[PDB]
Design a protein around this ligand. Structure first.
Ligand SMILES: [Zn+2]
Length: 114
């Protein structure tokens, strides 16, 4: 795919228009009409960006994920309650019950089929 829009937000916000995608944090299906989050990670090799699809609640529960609501794209399209989950997460100490962990464990990361 071709494009030309300098600058790209790390996180994305938009209601899933399908139920084919499956979260990575919980490894479940993301039914359409739901608020999810996609962690865009640029690569050095030649390959279409891989948006890490994860329930908006699967990420917010984690720590050191989002810096500010400004980093989230399309966040203005999300429902009020949803938009709050972001700002109310980036402003306040990410995570609850002081539950902080270094990223996520490794799961056969490599030969992943698909
Ligand atoms: Zn999930």
């Amino acid at each position: 795919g071709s494009s030309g829009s300098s600058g790209h937000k790390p996180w994305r916000a938009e209601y899933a228009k399908s139920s084919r995608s499956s979260c990575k944090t919980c490894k479940s299906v993301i039914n359409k009409e739901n608020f999810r989050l996609g962690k865009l990670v640029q690569s050095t090799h030649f390959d279409g960006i891989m948006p890490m699809w994860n329930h908006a609640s699967c990420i917010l529960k984690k720590t050191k994920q989002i810096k500010s609501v400004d980093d989230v794209e399309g966040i203005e399209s999300l429902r009020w309650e949803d938009q709050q989950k972001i700002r109310k997460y980036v402003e306040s100490g990410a995570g609850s019950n002081t539950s902080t962990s270094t990223g996520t464990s490794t799961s056969s990361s490599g030969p992943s089929s698909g």
